[PDB]
Write a protein that holds these residues in place. Structure first.
Motif, PDB file in Angstrom:
ATOM      1  N   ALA A 101       0.807  -1.211   0.000  1.00  0.00           N
ATOM      2  CA  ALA A 101       0.000   0.000   0.000  1.00  0.00           C
ATOM      3  C   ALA A 101       0.844   1.267   0.000  1.00  0.00           C
TER       4      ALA A 101
ATOM      5  N   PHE B 274       6.001   0.042   7.660  1.00  0.00           N
ATOM      6  CA  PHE B 274       5.153   1.087   7.106  1.00  0.00           C
ATOM      7  C   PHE B 274       4.797   0.768   5.660  1.00  0.00           C
ATOM      8  N   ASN B 275       3.501   0.835   5.348  1.00  0.00           N
ATOM      9  CA  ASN B 275       2.959   0.515   4.026  1.00  0.00           C
ATOM     10  C   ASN B 275       3.277  -0.912   3.596  1.00  0.00           C
TER      11      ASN B 275
ATOM     12  N   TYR C  56       1.927  -4.429   4.869  1.00  0.00           N
ATOM     13  CA  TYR C  56       0.970  -4.997   5.810  1.00  0.00           C
ATOM     14  C   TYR C  56       0.575  -6.410   5.406  1.00  0.00           C
TER      15      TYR C  56
END
Lengths: 50, 50
Positions: free
Chosen positions: A11, A22-23, A25
């Motif tokens: 993402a 972070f980003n 997932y």
């Protein structure tokens, strides 16, 4: 239709496979059930006839 | 939220009600911000009901 493929959610704007961060997932999440939970969160069994 | 989202040294950003990556189209009548500093071990304690 049904989905089973386990691909990490990229993402972000970076070519991330990774494991976590972070980003980066893991899409799947685990339901947790115990009798102490109040009404409205205990598991329900659903059957649909078509 | 874009400048907050793209702030690099963020480690944990965990939501509980809606998707955390598309807040631009979502609008609210209120925003409440609370701040503190705690130990690492109890960092997971910020989840409600701990």
């Amino acid at each position: 239709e049904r989905d089973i493929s386990t691909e990490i959610y990229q993402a972000g704007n970076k070519p991330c496979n990774g494991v976590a961060g972070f980003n980066c997932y893991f899409p799947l999440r685990s339901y947790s059930f115990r009798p102490t939970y109040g009404v409205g969160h205990q598991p329900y069994r659903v059957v649909v006839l078509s | 939220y874009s400048v907050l989202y793209n702030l690099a040294p963020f480690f944990t950003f965990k939501c509980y009600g809606v998707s955390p990556t598309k807040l631009n189209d979502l609008c609210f009548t209120n925003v409440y911000a609370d701040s503190f500093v705690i130990r690492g071990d109890e960092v997971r304690q910020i989840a409600p009901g701990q």
